[PDB]
């Protein structure tokens, strides 16, 4: 039922920021084990067919105790890997547009303090997981969550994620996840970052 | 005034197994930081500088709330590596030997058995963490910790350990942990694991 969604890009086309095989791997292999265990955990359970990727994260208590956790973290796969995927491009970085230029120097002032914090976030999650902007309300603020735990457990809305899972940067970068997170920031895609962030409102 | 232990092999001795470039960077920098790290945590604090690692780990309840988070990650850091490097070998592998192998069989029926048990754990640990093999009273027993979290926490003593952070295997198996697991049989120095035995009593 879930499905492994297509890259808007080639593999190689976030070079040199992103490795080609390192994109491969992560897309081809990682995200699809993800997709196939969430459909595995599912496959029996028909009273949950018809709920969306959200609702099985907004709602995890009240599943099956012999599927919460592979649901837990099949669907938190599948859902930060789908969004992390959309917020890079080959002609992205640069500074924010749109509407959300706004209200992210409204609470960071700048877009260098955004980066600023988001990166230390990112970088200061121990062991695996992602950095987090979100929105909390009309609020804009930048958290961390271990494993492929996300925000919406929490009700707030992600509009931009990087993965600092050790697959995501090791065969480029080994133990160097902030010359990754530096390097990440070229690829951003701001356009898409902008849609989120009406969506959400 | 940790340090940074001397590997009883070179960095190319695990090979075909274990690359020697990941056992370089994985000993000369991960561990390092580790140390380094923790070092740094309890530089202010000379109440502790006579505490053993040990001692450290089994009573982080008690130590000062600005500094447990960081004894906690590096000093678990250093401990779960240091005991890594000591229970592998370019000697190691096969089945096992001396006083051990008989309490393998009492407690596992066979020892095929106990590495399916132990390999499961280790593959099941989602994110970062290690697979262990532990003395638990009297009885053996396998179990996986999260990130650099040791079995000392519930008084249970470490027998044998498998890295299986994606740093442990990356560079030479990307996504294929349990083709890693298989692989890092090949090396275990069954000698040092019937030491910590007989020590464990
Ligand atoms: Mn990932
Ligand atoms: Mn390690």
Known sequence: ???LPKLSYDYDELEPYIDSNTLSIHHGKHHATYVNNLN???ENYSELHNKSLEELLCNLETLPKEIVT???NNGGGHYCHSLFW???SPRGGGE???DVAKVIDYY???FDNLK???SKAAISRFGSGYGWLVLDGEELSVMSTPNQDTPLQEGKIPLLVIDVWEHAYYLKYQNRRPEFVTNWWHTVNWDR???KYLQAI
Chains 1, 2 share one sequence.
Request: zero cysteines; proline letters at 4%; aromatic letters at 8%.
């Open 1 to 3: 039922s879930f499905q």
């Open 40 to 42: 595995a955990a599912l």
């Open 70 to 72: 592979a649901v837990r």
């Open 86 to 88: 959309e917020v890079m």
């Open 96 to 98: 924010p547009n749109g």
């Open 108 to 110: 960071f002032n700048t």
């Open 116 to 118: 600023d914090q988001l």
């Open 193 to 195: 970052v902008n849609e």
